[PDB]
Design a protein around this ligand. Sequence first.
Ligand SMILES: Fc1ccc(CNC[C@H]2CCCO2)cc1
Ligand code: NI
Length: 341
Amino acid sequence: TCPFYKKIPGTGFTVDAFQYGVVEGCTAYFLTHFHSDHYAGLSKHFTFPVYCSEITGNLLKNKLHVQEQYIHPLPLDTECIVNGVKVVLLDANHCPGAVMILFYLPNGTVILHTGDFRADPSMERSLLADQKVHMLYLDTTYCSPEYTFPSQQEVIRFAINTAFEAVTLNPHALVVCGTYSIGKEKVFLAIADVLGSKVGMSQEKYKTLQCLNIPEINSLITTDMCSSLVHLLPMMQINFKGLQSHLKKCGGKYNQILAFRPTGWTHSNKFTRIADVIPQTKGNISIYGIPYSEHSSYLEMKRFVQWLKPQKIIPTVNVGTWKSRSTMEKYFREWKLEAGY
Ligand SMILES: Fc1ccc(CNC[C@H]2CCCO2)cc1
Ligand code: NI
């Protein structure tokens, strides 16, 4: 049974609601982005209309084998009519193809569904600038002040500098980056670029990256692992055992591994600054956990909501416990009293 916070009132629309069977009343299923918790339930035998970005559409077709007749890609930043209702897709600053959706209801109500997003001041000059939003369905992943982390630019600067130093000191070192979904591609792309290398990966991960409309992608990635000194592996293999095993396969070409595990927030954010971050080391293998987030920090979220001044907020993350729900409701009231809406 589909939960209330995935239904759009006054419409036949659901958002990220593919694991509940045939939802009664739903004429169009929107998909904000290609992450498994959100697409859960979609497969090649789906037979209702799916509305999404072009990039999400590419992934549905090629990775999940959803038939072409049911995929409805929409351009960004463009007023579109779907089943008699005006909608707009906006960039979410999440993973490739991720969108927020603006719905202009027949009765005059305006609803923004953020999907998953990393709020940014640039959103204050999108098509949101114009007008009033009555209901906000909000990605509240990190809605508590303890959730701090650096900008994506600061994290990438650290990764580039760390990798360039290590390989200039030891030209026989291999760099490895963990992945388990789309998103955070800048980490491995920026490291490979500083090292003058393509990024090597499995056939399955290459296929995924070929769906993302990244400019000049054929110049940046490869399935030929031997030609590359930056490799991608599943996140699960980024540990001393898995990396030891990988180094064996490389045919005495390398004598050191430097590995990166992009995480979200971890409690080491509460003590250590990005500049002060150190790896876990065993012999000739070192592993860095780096806090590269594709969700809003608490401060970024607060800024966005205080700018938008929505009449009602509906959280879409951390809704499963009374304590979490109460905590979020308290912050929403603080933000409203401070800003005066
Ligand atoms: F949005 C929320 C609000 C509250 C919580 C509960 N845990 C928060 C604690 C542990 C880690 C940092 O503070 C989770 C998500
Ligand atoms: Ni996501």
